[PDB]
Enzyme design. Structure first.
Site, PDB file in Angstrom:
ATOM      1  CE  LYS A 164      19.444 -21.704   8.090  1.00  0.00           C
ATOM      2  NZ  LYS A 164      20.128 -22.722   7.538  1.00  0.00           N
ATOM      3  CG  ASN A 211       2.204   0.449   3.808  1.00  0.00           C
ATOM      4  OD1 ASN A 211       3.404   0.999   3.818  1.00  0.00           O
ATOM      5  ND2 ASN A 211       1.820  -0.551   3.368  1.00  0.00           N
ATOM      6  N   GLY A 212       0.914  -1.698   6.269  1.00  0.00           N
ATOM      7  CA  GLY A 212       1.615  -2.560   7.038  1.00  0.00           C
ATOM      8  C   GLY A 212       0.820  -3.904   7.470  1.00  0.00           C
ATOM      9  NE  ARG A 247       5.684   2.984  -2.147  1.00  0.00           N
ATOM     10  CZ  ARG A 247       6.579   2.469  -1.197  1.00  0.00           C
ATOM     11  NH1 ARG A 247       6.137   1.912  -0.155  1.00  0.00           N
ATOM     12  NH2 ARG A 247       7.907   2.540  -1.404  1.00  0.00           N
ATOM     13  CD  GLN A 284      22.773 -21.768  11.971  1.00  0.00           C
ATOM     14  OE1 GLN A 284      23.322 -22.430  12.583  1.00  0.00           O
ATOM     15  NE2 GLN A 284      21.671 -21.540  11.397  1.00  0.00           N
ATOM     16  CB  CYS A 289      31.413 -34.096   5.173  1.00  0.00           C
ATOM     17  SG  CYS A 289      30.746 -35.131   3.787  1.00  0.00           S
ATOM     18  CB  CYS A 314      25.571 -37.663   1.009  1.00  0.00           C
ATOM     19  SG  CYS A 314      24.510 -37.339   2.240  1.00  0.00           S
ATOM     20  CD  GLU A 370      21.417 -18.592   2.213  1.00  0.00           C
ATOM     21  OE1 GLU A 370      20.836 -19.439   2.592  1.00  0.00           O
ATOM     22  OE2 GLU A 370      21.157 -17.476   2.646  1.00  0.00           O
ATOM     23  CB  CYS A 384      26.060 -30.879   6.940  1.00  0.00           C
ATOM     24  SG  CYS A 384      25.125 -32.323   6.482  1.00  0.00           S
ATOM     25  CB  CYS A 411      -1.020   0.017   1.346  1.00  0.00           C
ATOM     26  SG  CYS A 411      -2.046  -1.475   1.299  1.00  0.00           S
ATOM     27  CD  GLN A 425      17.791 -23.400   4.584  1.00  0.00           C
ATOM     28  OE1 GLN A 425      18.765 -22.272   4.632  1.00  0.00           O
ATOM     29  NE2 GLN A 425      18.181 -24.439   4.369  1.00  0.00           N
ATOM     30  CG  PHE A 481      -0.588  -4.969  -3.117  1.00  0.00           C
ATOM     31  CD1 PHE A 481       0.643  -4.325  -3.962  1.00  0.00           C
ATOM     32  CD2 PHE A 481      -0.809  -6.114  -3.094  1.00  0.00           C
ATOM     33  CE1 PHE A 481       1.320  -5.445  -4.742  1.00  0.00           C
ATOM     34  CE2 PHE A 481      -0.281  -7.162  -3.983  1.00  0.00           C
ATOM     35  CZ  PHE A 481       0.794  -6.901  -4.715  1.00  0.00           C
TER      36      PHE A 481
END
Ligand SMILES: Cc1cc2nc3c(=O)[nH]c(=O)nc-3n(C[C@H](O)[C@H](O)[C@H](O)COP(=O)(O)O)c2cc1C
Ligand SMILES: O=C(O)CCC(=O)C(=O)O
Ligand code: F3S
Length: 1491
Positions: free
Chosen positions: A956, A227-228, A31, A962, A1132, A1121, A887, A1127, A1, A953, A207
């Site tokens: 977590k 907005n929020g 927006r 991490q 490993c 594996c 990542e 891991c 919004c 993911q 929105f």
């Protein structure tokens, strides 16, 4: 919004302001969203003063006297279209107006043009009229609006899409509708009538997350535009509703308050409820500013800015005890008709920029570009920082600034004096060291009976006490859902944590801990409406974990305390159900007798559980008494303390508080710690092999610190700051609890699969009773054990697969490991019900075709060795499928096809790999964009066929990636542009994405740089994903990935692996359904992952609506594996999940083996298609009618599950066109297209010539320069270009100005910019200066927004003015000079150089692990604003540091003409001593920091 306000303080009320508001709305179109017809809007509206000049014509036509302004009530009403229904509605409005002793003057038909509306809004449109009203007794102003408020509340009992009062006031009116911004004034003729004048406007563009517009849901509402997203809503509603029967204020009768009745309702939106609660506060005697301060309070603790305002701290100190925050991102804009103002949430998660002229004309909005005022007479450009407000007093003609507003509210009562006299605080640094029990036999028996298992104490409690943190583990939750398990589990295990994704962000519990608090208040909750000393009578806790010392102190204290037993006799008459009945009745009676604190204990009279007794599980007990007290109207009379043996993990404490506990004494958990420390084996170890750095008080302290840290983590997953807000809220989804149980104790929790009755939970506790009445049993739970819980992955299963696949059977041995499985996932309860005869295999689509739907998915190059990572990429590319660079970025050498493979399959280019061939490429088809932005470079983005925004993911979901420091080799540090030994904990949120519209902006930025790449958004399954996914589709995503709670990981908290996230069956199915029902299904391809192994898994995922299939853990197994599950350890054994060079050398694994694996799965898919009688996966996607419940399955713990959630999907037999997707969605026409079309620009790119161009900019011009950057990067990479392009701009730049900038690009901007300037900048120069005609001192004014330089890998930014928060957030190598900033400057910085020539906000350098920053501090309060976790502040001593700072300021002056820079350079010697240099411990020995 988008939202904002405009106010004319000094001039006569005019039409210009109204036109300006409509224009501002138009600049915020991006927006908001649109309905399925791509024409009707999600909502646009304006609130203004009453248009008196316009209404005068109505009075004139009628020969009627017009009452004075404060005497004329006007109601803007949506009515039924059907005439007979319309008249019943009208008669009702008039009836209640008369009951308030007001007179109806008549009605005005509102002039509209319905032919400008989109088809859905046109179909939907109510009949719109205004009612005109007066008071014959002579009420006016406040009293008249009060009676109209009452009238509105009564009329609102009949709310319908068709019958709704937008506003009813003598001061304010709202014109709103289901329209795009530029359509609003074309629909309402009044708004384009030059006779419409107003001294203010509040405007809003909505929105929504659906495609079905309802007119009442446009904003503004009656008081507020919002907005929020409220992330604690269920709790906020429950607490407020509990206040309703007991409302009392001077100036109001009980009957008038009763008329207001349901102030709040869970059926209604967060925005509706907030408007309502806030208006209740306003109309009972507070300004809207004070109302917002109470409902959405500032993070006032540890705020240096409040040093000279003790009364403001006192106000919040007081209200903290009375009212929990309605938390979540927010910009609130509101008006009384007396005041108009704005405020942000405690974390400032929505932007708010403002403008003031020489005449005190003021414009505020989500974006700075938005009203064209003569640049010369702007006297200030500002912003709201976190928690801040700004307002206008219309009658006084005054602008009110943040602390002026708050101080005025705070000085109304002696809040602090009240607290001093009335409040008791209970806290103890000491624990009790004496053991509860003397026989370790007693301890063990109590442990067994209350559900402690060997892994519980060994893998969970002990590490918490010995290390002071909850344990880290790896890989996915491989085990049956608790309800499907044959093993006994705890009631806690049936609850999954909910978390934030897209529609609101998680917060960082470490870096931004300063904003959070675990404080809790015990006893009766005071009158919210009437402040009094009495209401401060409470017991404050600093933490919900009460130790034995603290528990005794509470039992003493100033409040009436009562003990309530959760034990009962096993006499063959009592059951858990009547024990629960008795518990609830006792609690009510006890509260009725005056108890202000109830201690719910499974150790009544200090007596132990015996073989002749059982217990009500503490979560069941607390939930039941919480809800039954609510039902009794007694909830605000007392607080609940759980005194229980069955609580030891981080998840346990969270569930307990989530369902009503104010505090917990985990007495057996503490005793467990005592007994571990006092165990000769432990004492003997400490003499050598365990850290004897631990006396008993430290072990206990560590345990508590672990729990507290774990609670901050769980809260932050949802973006929640205060345990007080989390307390009512029920931030979980239940899996496997029946409706009756959920209604009794967990009312309002979703539990979509049915399941356990009360009797079933008792059966479960009795399993533990039977085990209790030498050592605790070790079940299979964390690591596979021979006789334990089943795990889908195990070493033996893994080894047979790997050998089958390396051979060209081993596969049949592997195949039966899987089929001998007990029921494990929801899909295991289902089987096929074919609607067609089987066909022959030869008719079925080829394996080559099927394999195209398979993805290996994003496992970072840090988590995996480059050997395992690259091998997967080569295999997927050979297949014509896709792999994903998770990542950690990607090595550029991989972008090229292999040319140099010898006859043995080796390549000098990638010599660590095996079994290669000349066509091969290790390029990841999917490039990932995660919160850390480690990969994220223009060349990297151009190398992707697809780009994935990773929100979460499965292992977590509330949290960031991490990577343990030990795995950050020099190689990894190079790829990520970070420091070699240093642990990388990525930010939980993208600092880029605090809302759906911000996600739409990132998707736009990616389509901008690489218009050929499809953009996916990776989400995790949980209730609410469906709604979220509809938003994502409206945000122009090409693909949505749904990840299951199941999926693997190289490192995650064990609690997160076991307790956060839901099954993909629920996720895929919910997203598919919601998209289809909103007619959005064709907009996106759906991908699924989480425990996919097999052709059967694929077919199940297909039937549930998934078109593509992701594989992580199983793909690693195909590569060798062996499920060692180390891991996170870097050890490993097989060289897969390690960076150790000598373990990497053990990697066997050739692309051909993983190719073979995927052909095996695809062949299985073909056999299943043939069986079903279909030729193609395309024919069966979404055909949930081919599913039935398996009849050969009997569950251990319950009769059955309810599976409508999986079976009841829209029919898809005949309607299948949603399978046809557009290749990639467009941004539409963009300024960069005009730049790129220019022959001089084409020449500069292709011939590396010099070019210069100049353009006018507006705020709707987003991501400028970025498409040119992509074009250069596609041709030359990041560093190959030798040309020189200068782009000059004038105006207000939209979001993401100069994103992904490269060397050879110079961007000059005269004016100002919105958020994300230089986002992912890699090179070149961005220079931002005010207009030449600007008269203000540039250094005192905002010129740039939030999250500038996010993830920058190079480049230089020079801005002659101030920035917002998170400047240089996750900077890796960017350089900049700016003249001041908001909070969190340099937040996750790992390199580069930042110079700030002016004041900065708090939390400086949080998580800053490398690079240098320089802060000019002429006030002297900078040391108070540092986050001291990592950086050190020092005066400049090193000559190299002085010269580095001087050179940057000198550059800044040359580029900008900065008057502030000039003054520094003119008096270098005087200013040098006022700088501080921020130095992380990686930079301690750099020449510019040392010597
Ligand atoms: C070793 C490891 C590292 C991973 N790292 C990432 C990460 O870089 N980014 C991401 O989005 N997901 C990451 N994940 C999750 C995977 O992308 C995927 O969603 C998950 O493995 C699917 O479940 P499965 O392992 O049961 O097949 C990783 C998973 C594992 C196995
Ligand atoms: O490598 C990273 O930074 C994140 C990877 C991660 O969190 C995982 O292994 O699940
Ligand atoms: S579980 Fe992890 S430690 Fe190695 S053997 Fe498999 S990658």
């Amino acid at each position: 919004c988008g939202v904002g306000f405009i106010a004319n303080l000094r001039g006569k009320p005019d039409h210009t302001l109204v036109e300006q508001a409509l224009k501002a709305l138009g600049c915020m179109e991006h927006r908001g969203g649109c309905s399925a017809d791509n024409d009707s809007g999600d909502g646009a509206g304006v609130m203004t003063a009453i248009p008196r000049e316009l209404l005068a014509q109505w009075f004139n036509t009628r020969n009627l006297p017009m009452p004075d302004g404060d005497r004329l009530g006007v109601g803007m009403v949506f009515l039924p279209q059907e005439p007979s229904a319309r008249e019943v509605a009208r008669a009702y409005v008039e009836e209640v107006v008369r009951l308030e002793k007001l007179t109806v003057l008549g009605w005005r038909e509102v002039p509209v043009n319905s032919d400008v509306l989109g088809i859905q809004a046109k179909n939907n449109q109510p009949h719109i009229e205004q009612i005109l009203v007066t008071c014959p007794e002579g009420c006016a102003g406040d009293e008249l609006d009060r009676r109209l408020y009452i009238a509105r509340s009564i009329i609102g009992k009949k709310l319908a899409e068709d019958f709704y009062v937008c506003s009813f006031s003598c001061r304010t009116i709202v014109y709103k509708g289901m329209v795009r911004s530029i359509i609003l004034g074309e629909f309402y003729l009044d708004l384009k009538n030059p006779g419409y004048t107003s001294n203010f406007a509040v405007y809003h563009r909505r929105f929504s997350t659906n495609t079905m517009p309802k007119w009442p849901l446009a904003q503004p509402m009656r008081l507020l535009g919002h907005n929020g997203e409220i992330n604690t809503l269920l709790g906020n509603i429950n607490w407020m509703a509990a206040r309703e029967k007991e409302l009392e204020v001077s100036g109001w009768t009980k009957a008038e308050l009763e008329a207001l009745t349901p102030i709040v309702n869970q059926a209604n939106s967060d925005s509706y409820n907030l408007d309502s609660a806030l208006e209740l506060l306003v109309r009972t005697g507070r300004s809207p500013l004070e109302a917002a301060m109470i409902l959405v309070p500032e993070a006032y603790k540890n705020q240096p800015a409040l040093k000279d305002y003790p009364e403001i701290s006192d106000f919040h100190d007081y209200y903290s005890g009375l009212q929990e925050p309605w938390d979540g991102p927010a910009l609130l804009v509101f008006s009384d008709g007396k005041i108009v103002g704005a405020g942000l949430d405690r974390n400032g998660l929505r932007p708010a920029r403002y403008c003031i002229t020489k005449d005190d004309y003021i414009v505020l909005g989500s974006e700075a570009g938005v009203v064209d005022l003569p640049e010369v007479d702007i006297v200030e450009k500002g912003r709201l920082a976190p928690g801040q407000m700004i307002a206008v007093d219309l009658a006084e003609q005054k602008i009110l600034k943040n602390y002026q507003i708050k101080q005025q509210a705070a000085q109304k009562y002696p809040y602090g004096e009240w607290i001093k006299i009335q409040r008791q605080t209970v806290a103890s640094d000491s624990f009790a060291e004496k053991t509860l029990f003397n026989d370790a036999q007693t301890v063990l028996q109590q442990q067994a009976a209350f559900g402690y298992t060997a892994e519980d104490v060994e893998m969970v409690v002990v590490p918490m006490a010995s290390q002071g943190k909850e344990p880290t583990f790896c890989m996915g939750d491989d085990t049956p859902l608790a309800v499907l398990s044959h093993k006994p589990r705890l009631l806690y295990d049936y609850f999954k944590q909910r978390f934030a994704q897209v529609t609101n962000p998680p917060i960082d519990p470490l870096r931004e801990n300063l904003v959070m608090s675990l404080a809790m208040f015990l006893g009766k909750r005071g009158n919210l409406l009437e402040p009094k000393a009495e209401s401060a009578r409470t017991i404050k806790l600093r933490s919900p974990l009460v130790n034995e010392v603290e528990l005794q102190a509470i039992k003493t204290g100033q409040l009436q305390v009562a003990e309530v037993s959760t034990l009962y006799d096993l006499d063959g008459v009592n059951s858990l159900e009547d024990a629960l009945t008795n518990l609830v009745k006792t609690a009510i009676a006890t509260v009725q007798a005056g108890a202000e604190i109830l201690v719910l204990t499974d150790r009544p009279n200090g007596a132990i559980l015996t073989e002749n007794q059982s217990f009500i599980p503490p979560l069941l007990a607390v939930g039941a008494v919480h809800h039954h007290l609510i039902r009794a109207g007694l909830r605000l009379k007392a607080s609940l303390i759980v005194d229980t043996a069955q609580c030891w993990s981080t998840h346990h404490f969270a569930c307990l508080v989530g369902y009503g506990a104010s505090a917990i004494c985990p007495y057996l958990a503490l005793e467990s710690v005592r007994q571990w420390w006092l165990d000769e084996k432990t004492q003997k170890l400490m003499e050598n092999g365990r850290l004897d750095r631990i006396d008993l008080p430290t072990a206990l302290k560590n345990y508590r610190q672990s729990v507290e840290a774990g609670l901050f983590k769980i809260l932050s997953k949802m973006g929640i700051s205060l345990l007080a807000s989390y307390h009512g809220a029920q931030i979980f989804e239940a899996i496997g609890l029946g409706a009756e149980l959920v209604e009794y104790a967990f009312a309002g929790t979703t539990s979509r699969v049915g399941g356990l009755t009360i009797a079933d939970v008792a059966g479960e506790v009795m399993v533990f009773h039977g085990m209790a009445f030498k050592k605790l049993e070790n079940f299979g739970f964390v690591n596979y054990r021979p006789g334990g819980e089943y795990h889908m992955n195990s070493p033996e299963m893994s080894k047979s697969l790997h050998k089958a696949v390396a051979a060209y059977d081993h596969y049949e041995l592997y195949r039966q490991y899987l089929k001998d499985r007990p029921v494990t996932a929801l899909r295991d309860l289902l089987d096929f019900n074919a609607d067609q005869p089987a066909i022959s295999l030869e008719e079925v689509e080829s394996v080559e075709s099927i394999v195209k739907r398979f993805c290996t998915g994003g496992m970072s190059l840090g988590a995996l060795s480059r050997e395992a990572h690259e091998t997967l990429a080569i295999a997927m590319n050979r297949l014509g499928a896709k792999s994903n660079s998770g990542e950690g970025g990607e090595d550029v050498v991989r972008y090229l096809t292999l040319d140099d493979v010898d006859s043995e399959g080796n390549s000098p280019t990638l010599p660590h790999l095996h079994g290669l061939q000349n066509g091969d490429t290790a390029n990841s088809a999917i490039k990932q964009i995660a919160s850390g932005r480690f990969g994220v470079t223009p060349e990297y983005l151009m190398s992707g066929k697809q780009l994935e925004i990773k929100m979460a993911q499965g292992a977590k979901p509330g949290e960031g990636g991490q990577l343990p420091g030990k795995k950050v080799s020099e190689y990894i540090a190079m790829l990520r542009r970070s420091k070699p030994g240093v642990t990388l904990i990525s930010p939980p949120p993208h600092h880029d994405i605090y809302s759906i519209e911000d996600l739409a902006q990132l998707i736009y930025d990616l389509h901008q740089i690489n218009p050929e790449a499809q953009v996916s958004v990776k989400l995790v399954a949980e209730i609410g994903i469906g709604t979220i996914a509809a938003g994502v589709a409206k945000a122009n995503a090409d693909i949505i990935q749904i990840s299951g709670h199941d999926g693997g990981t190289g490192a995650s908290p064990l609690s997160s692996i076991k307790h956060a996230g839901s099954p993909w069956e629920l996720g895929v199915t919910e997203v598919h359904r919601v998209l289809m029902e909103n007619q959005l299904r064709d907009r996106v391809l759906l991908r699924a992952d989480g425990g996919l192994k097999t052709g059967w898994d694929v077919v199940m995922a297909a039937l549930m609506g998934a078109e593509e299939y992701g594989f992580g853990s199983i793909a690693m197994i195909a590569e060798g594996c062996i499920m060692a599950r180390v891991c996170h350890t870097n050890n490993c054994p097989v060289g897969v999940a390690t960076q150790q060079e000598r373990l990497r050398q053990r990697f066997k694994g050739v692309p051909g083996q993983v190719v073979n694996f995927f052909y095996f799965i695809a062949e299985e898919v073909r056999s299943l298609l043939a069986h079903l009688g279909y030729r193609s996966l395309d024919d069966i996607i979404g055909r949930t009618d081919l599913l039935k419940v398996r009849s050969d399955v009997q569950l251990s713990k319950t009769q059955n599950l309810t599976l409508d959630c999986l079976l009841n999907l829209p029919d898809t037999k005949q309607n299948r066109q949603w399978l046809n997707h557009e290749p990639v969605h467009s941004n539409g026409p963009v300024l960069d297209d005009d730049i790129l079309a220019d022959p001089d620009i084409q020449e500069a790119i292709n011939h590396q010539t010099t070019a210069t161009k100049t353009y006018r900019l507006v705020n709707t011009d987003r991501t400028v320069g970025t498409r040119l950057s992509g074009a250069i990067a596609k041709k030359y990479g990041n560093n190959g270009f030798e040309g020189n392009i200068t782009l000059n701009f004038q105006g207000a730049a939209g979001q993401s100005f100069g994103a992904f900038n490269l060397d050879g690009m110079t961007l000059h901007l005269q004016g100002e910019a919105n958020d994300y300037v230089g986002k992912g900048m890699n090179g070149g120069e961005i220079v931002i200066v005010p207009h030449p005609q600007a008269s203000f001192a540039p250094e005192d004014n905002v010129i740039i927004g939030n999250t500038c330089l996010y993830g920058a890998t190079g480049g230089n930014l020079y801005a002659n003015g101030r920035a917002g928060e998170r400047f240089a957030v996750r900077n890796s190598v960017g350089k900049a000079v700016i003249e001041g900033a908001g909070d969190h400057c340099c937040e996750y910085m790992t390199g580069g150089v930042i110079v700030v020539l002016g004041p900065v906000g708090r939390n400086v350098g949080a998580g800053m692990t490398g690079g240098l920053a320089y802060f000019l501090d002429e006030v002297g309060d900078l040391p108070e604003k540092i986050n001291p976790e990592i950086i050190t502040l020092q005066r400049i001593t090193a000559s190299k540091g002085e010269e580095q700072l001087k050179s940057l300021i000198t550059a800044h002056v040359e580029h900008t003409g900065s008057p502030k820079g000039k003054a520094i350079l003119a008096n270098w010697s005087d200013y040098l001593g006022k700088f501080w240099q921020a130095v992380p411990p990686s930079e301690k020995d750099s020449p510019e920091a040392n010597n």
